Design a protein around this ligand. Structure first.
Ligand code: CHL
Ligand code: CHL
Ligand code: CHL
Ligand code: CHL
Ligand code: CHL
Ligand code: CLA
Ligand code: CLA
Ligand code: CLA
Ligand SMILES: CC1=C[C@H](O)CC(C)(C)[C@H]1/C=C/C(C)=C/C=C/C(C)=C/C=C/C=C(C)/C=C/C=C(C)/C=C/C1=C(C)C[C@H](O)CC1(C)C
Ligand SMILES: CC1=C[C@H](O)CC(C)(C)[C@H]1/C=C/C(C)=C/C=C/C(C)=C/C=C/C=C(C)/C=C/C=C(C)/C=C/C1=C(C)C[C@H](O)CC1(C)C
Lengths: 64, 35, 223, 218, 218
């Protein structure tokens, strides 16, 4: 018994799903795979930017 | 087109995985031994 | 009889009542699995000793695929046949129209579906006939007409008729009032849809592989 | 002329090979009773040798026809680069990778160790399916599955099915003999087999096989 | 026991055709069931194959470690002249005989045929002892004797002793596989194995193995 707007009627199924969370593990292992890939990606760009990992198309000459 | 930097680099991504696998195997070798 | 894995372990919630049902779940994305409901924590900081959620509290909210009336999220769950049939049919019909249209445009004009925008923003030449429009007016007309079409197709409440509407307007020839004839037509349409979606995915991968035209790739193939 | 029962045609002929190895009297295709070593007195071992001979025959037909075909294509109307099944391995390291079918617009594959790893994974999965079934139908016959493997249904009549068994294993023994011929002449002539056939058509009696007999001289 | 019994870790995992050949169901260490050829259908023959395999394993351990050792010693703190097992055989013919550890303060034997005669005599005596059972322990088992020549004797607890059986057999199969690798590398590269490991670490994607894949061509 609160206040009613047309947006209050519209957006209510977005604020409906309160608590429907999965038993078991779910997508946790896949999440771990994406986290390890993201960590490896950051390690790649960090060593490129430090130039501890010299590539071919990467100049690092303050020049392009 | 692999430089020697990338050559000696990819062994580290191997080696860190081997270290974490050694951690996980050291967990499994005594944990499920006891239980 | 004709499964993707011929006489193997079938999924439990796939039988054959649906037309293109061949027992295909390695992932099980259409599973009838329930959802453990955890209540809200004691978020009243007037008093001491607030608490947390509730572990194995509710009877886990037996999932249903009944279409409601709410224009935002009508089906009230995503993982279910009563959404996935409609999603597969709509994606397949758009893929059939798109895969035919790319080939017909490449055959007539000679410009890819990839490079069609670059030759059609400067001149609206439908087969070289110089339509008067411009890109802004095209976006306005496209958005308002396809939006009116989608807001009128969502209004149907029958979960069968949200993909198989029937009636008078869309079935102009009334060739789907039969049982077995319409079942054969649905199980033909779903196979042609499954072909066209994979081939438009192949069009996208050929576009990623440094340009194509679906016959410009064949002109690359020419020898 | 029946290849079954006690009246199967021996490999010899009208000499019926008196005092046969008595542990096989028909009941299986390809039986001629030619067991001079007699390595299969135990029936379980004999079943294992049937399995192994069957799998080697069904590999050897493809191993024959894949070694015949591209040299015919290159001699007739195309060019493949290194169209000989010796240098089909060395085609990868030649210029820019292996171009299949002699076309530098299709497959164009490099990274031979990655190709080998893909080959290892695919062959391991299909062999692990091959042994104990799983998918592709229930594991029903280690010898002759043919449920979906015979999608035209030639296993209807059992007499014609045994006829196709006998034709199958006759042709399989021929293919296994021919591939050993390819492997011996691979060391001997160092050439293509169709080139060897043309050399025999040139010299049927003066360069036939014994010109290449003084090679292995210590 | 997870290692052997009705639920041993079978040699292909989930695809390991979980109904073994019925002539072996556990009862011995190192049993997975990989006799697909079926060459041990008789139990006495199977016993002979164990009798051969355990002896080959126990020689394979020492044959592995004797080849791993000297290049590691030459890298760490010593030198041997020729510290490589390839040309280690010709070191008696090298200048004046062989020097163990590279040290002419110890054995330095010459007259290689006389050393071979001493080897033949001592090996004939100890192999005859291994067959029949003689001094330094009476023969009770041809494979697992377990007597006063065990200065520690870890055959007390039966479960841990079965674990040691399984570990011995697994290390034996690994040592056999390693020595077969040493022999095939001895054929192919003509180089020391630790040198080959360093060369592969220097060039992983080019000097892997397929650089040495155009050698045995006609
Ligand atoms: C929603 C569906 C939709 C899809 C899939 C596309 C697809 C595309 N539009 Mg597009 N459009 C779409 C809707 C619409 N477009 C346009 C109007 C335009 C214009 C004016 C242009 C495009 C262009 C493009 C392309 C840009 C990326 C590219 O070059 O990739 C292919 C290339 C790769 C994947 C990599 C290739 C590497 C190397 C560069 C070669 C791409 C193929 C551009 C184009 O034609 O570029 C060729 C362009 O100029 N579109 C309108 C307004 C009516 C749309 C309405 O919804
Ligand atoms: C009528 C007489 C008759 C004769 C003589 C043979 C002969 C033979 N048949 Mg048989 N057959 C005959 C009737 C029939 N056969 C068959 C169908 C078959 C089949 C399907 C098969 C046979 C096979 C055999 C062989 C069985 C043993 C073997 O493998 O020898 C092989 C060993 C030799 C022949 C010795 C090699 C002699 C060679 C000239 C040596 C070359 C000298 C070199 C220069 C030395 C190298 C020097 C080096 C060291 C530097 C044997 C040669 C088997 C076979 O052919 O296997 C090879 C076989 O698979 N026969 C049919 C139709 C049903 C017959 C009907 O009449
Ligand atoms: C499995 C069948 C197979 C066989 C028999 C061969 C053999 C050959 N390859 Mg090859 N390959 C095979 C598959 C593959 N190869 C390659 C990659 C390459 C490369 C890069 C090259 C070769 C080359 C060669 C030739 C080397 C000549 C030689 O070593 O003499 C030994 C062989 C014979 C004397 C006759 C062959 C049969 C004989 C009875 C011995 C075979 C023994 C066993 C049946 C094999 C063991 C089975 C395994 C599974 C344990 C020869 C044609 C080289 C070449 O091109 O030379 C011109 C070369 O450069 N191969 C790959 C991708 C990784 C394969 C995948 O399956
Ligand atoms: C997950 C699936 C799985 C797969 C695919 C395998 C695979 C294998 N296991 Mg295995 N295992 C698997 C699960 C498990 N295994 C084991 C523990 C063991 C053990 C102890 C052993 C195996 C062995 C084997 C082999 C048995 C078949 C064989 O002999 O190869 C025959 C087929 C080939 C050799 C084909 C190889 C293809 C190769 C690329 C050819 C090379 C191409 C050349 C270029 C061509 C040649 C050219 C010429 C000139 C020479 C096979 C490689 C046996 C083994 O390692 O033998 C060596 C063995 O002793 N496994 C465990 C723990 C319980 C598992 C649990 O998951
Ligand atoms: C039994 C094990 C044994 C093995 C494998 C070898 C092998 C070798 N010895 Mg040798 N020897 C062995 C014992 C003995 N040797 C010698 C005395 C010498 C001398 C003076 C010389 C050698 C040399 C050699 C090399 C010869 C190259 C060659 O022929 O390539 C063929 C071999 C391969 C390509 C590798 C193996 C392939 C294959 C797996 C062979 C295995 C055969 C059988 C399976 C194992 C034997 C079974 C036995 C029980 C009958 C090679 C490293 C020569 C050398 O060092 O040159 C630089 C040399 O001058 N040996 C004595 C004292 C009399 C031995 C007694 O134990
Ligand atoms: C938990 C323990 C731990 C942690 C956090 C670190 C952390 C670090 N060490 Mg270190 N180290 C450790 C233990 C550890 N060490 C031990 C035990 C030793 C003794 C052997 C050493 C010896 C050592 C040396 C000698 C050096 C380091 C260095 C470093 C630094 C850089 C390492 C790098 O770039 O690799 C990056 C590694 C990763 C990003 C991990 C790989 C993860 C990717 C995504 C792969 C995914 C996992 C992979 C698949 C494997 C899984 C197996 C699979 C089968 C499941 C970093 C701070 C260096 C240093 O000090 O810098 C100056 C250095 O030179 N370490
Ligand atoms: C000509 C050789 C030949 C013959 C006579 C047979 C005969 C038989 N096979 Mg068989 N097989 C062969 C080759 C052959 N096979 C090869 C090479 C393989 C490996 C690919 C197999 C794999 C195989 C399996 C896995 C199974 C059989 C089965 C059978 C049996 C029943 C099926 C049947 O009637 O086949 C009759 C076959 C023919 C009449 C041969 C026709 C040859 C055509 C005309 C040539 C076409 C080749 C083509 C051009 C290749 C390129 C196409 C490719 C690019 C897609 C019968 C014993 C089944 C069985 O016994 O279970 C009951 C079974 O499960 N076979
Ligand atoms: C000295 C060689 C030798 C011998 C005699 C045996 C003997 C035996 N093994 Mg065994 N094995 C060996 C080496 C050997 N093994 C190696 C090197 C490995 C590791 C790959 C294994 C891994 C293994 C497993 C995983 C299992 C056995 C099993 C068995 C037993 C039954 C199988 C049988 O009948 O084998 C009889 C053996 C022979 C007739 C020897 C044939 C020698 C041929 C001629 C060698 C050349 C062919 C070879 C395949 C070439 C390719 C080499 C390549 C694979 C590296 C039997 C006691 C089973 C068991 O229960 O264990 C007790 C079992 O499940 N083996
Ligand atoms: C019965 C009897 C009796 C008495 O008593 C005793 C005795 C004598 C022992 C017996 C006999 C036996 C025999 C005869 C055996 C034989 C075998 C063989 C020959 C096999 C082959 C076998 C053969 C085979 C498998 C083959 C295979 C093949 C292959 C893989 C191939 C492959 C390939 C191809 C595709 C093509 C490409 O490009 C390349 C290559 C890579 C080249
Ligand atoms: C089981 C089965 C089953 C199924 O059914 C069938 C089949 C498959 C047939 C089967 C298999 C088999 C196999 C695989 C086998 C293998 C083996 C081996 C490899 C061995 C090694 C083996 C190896 C070995 C012993 C080795 C040894 C070594 C040695 C002594 C060394 C010595 C030495 C040294 C110290 C150093 C110096 O300076 C010198 C010399 C003098 C040189």
């Amino acid at each position: 018994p609160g206040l009613v707007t047309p947006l209050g009627t519209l957006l209510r199924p977005l604020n409906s799903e309160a608590g429907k969370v999965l038993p078991g593990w779910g997508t946790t292992v896949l999440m771990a795979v994406f986290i390890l890939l993201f960590a490896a990606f950051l390690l790649i760009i960090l060593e490129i930017y430090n130039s501890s990992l010299i590539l071919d198309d990467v100049s690092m000459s303050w020049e392009t | 087109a692999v430089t020697p930097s990338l050559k000696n680099f990819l062994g580290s991504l191997i080696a860190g995985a081997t270290v974490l696998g050694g951690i996980a195997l050291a967990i499994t070798a005594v944990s499920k031994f006891d239980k | 009889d004709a499964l993707w894995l011929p006489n193997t372990t079938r999924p439990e919630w796939l039988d054959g009542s649906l037309p293109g049902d061949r027992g295909f779940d390695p992932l099980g994305l259409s599973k009838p699995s329930e959802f453990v409901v955890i209540g809200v924590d004691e978020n009243d900081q007037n008093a001491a000793k607030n608490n947390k959620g509730s572990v194995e509290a509710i009877v886990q909210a037996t999932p249903d695929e009944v279409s409601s009336e709410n224009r935002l999220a009508p089906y009230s769950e995503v993982f279910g046949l009563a959404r996935f049939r409609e999603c597969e049919l709509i994606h397949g019909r758009w893929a059939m129209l798109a895969c035919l249209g790319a080939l017909v445009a490449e055959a007539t004009t000679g410009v890819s579906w990839v490079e069609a925008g670059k030759v059609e923003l400067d001149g609206a030449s439908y087969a070289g006939l110089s339509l008067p429009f411009s890109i802004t007016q095209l976006i306005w007309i496209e958005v308002i007409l396809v939006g009116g079409a989608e807001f009128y197709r969502n209004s149907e409440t029958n979960p069968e008729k949200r993909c198989y509407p029937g009636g008078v307007f869309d079935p102009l020839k009334l060739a789907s009032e039969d049982e077995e004839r319409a079942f054969r037509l649905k199980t033909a349409e779903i196979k042609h849809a499954r072909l066209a979606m994979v081939s438009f995915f192949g069009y996208g991968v050929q576009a990623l592989s440094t340009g194509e035209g679906a016959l410009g790739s064949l002109a690359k193939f020419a020898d | 002329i029946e290849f079954y029962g006690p009246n199967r045609a021996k490999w010899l002929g009208p000499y019926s090979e008196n005092a046969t190895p008595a542990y096989l009297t028909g009941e299986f295709p390809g039986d001629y009773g030619w067991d001079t070593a007699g390595l299969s007195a135990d029936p379980e071992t004999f079943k294992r040798y049937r399995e192994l001979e069957l799998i080697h025959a069904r590999w050897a037909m493809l191993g024959a026809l894949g070694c015949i075909t591209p040299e015919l294509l290159a001699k007739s109307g195309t060019q493949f680069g290194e169209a000989v099944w010796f240098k089909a391995g060395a085609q990868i390291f030649s210029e820019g990778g292996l171009d299949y079918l002699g076309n530098p617009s299709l497959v164009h594959a490099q990274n031979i160790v990655a190709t080998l790893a893909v080959q290892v994974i695919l062959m391991g999965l299909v062999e692990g399916y091959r042994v104990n079934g799983g998918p592709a139908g229930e594991g029903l016959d280690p010898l002759y599955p043919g449920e979906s493997f015979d999608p035209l249904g030639l296993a209807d009549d059992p007499d014609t099915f045994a006829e196709l068994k006998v034709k199958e294993i006759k042709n399989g023994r021929l293919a296994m003999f021919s591939m050993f011929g390819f492997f011996v002449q691979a060391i001997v002539t160092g050439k293509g087999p169709i080139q060897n056939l043309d050399d025999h058509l040139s010299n049927p009696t003066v360069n036939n096989a014994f010109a290449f007999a003084t090679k292995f001289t210590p």
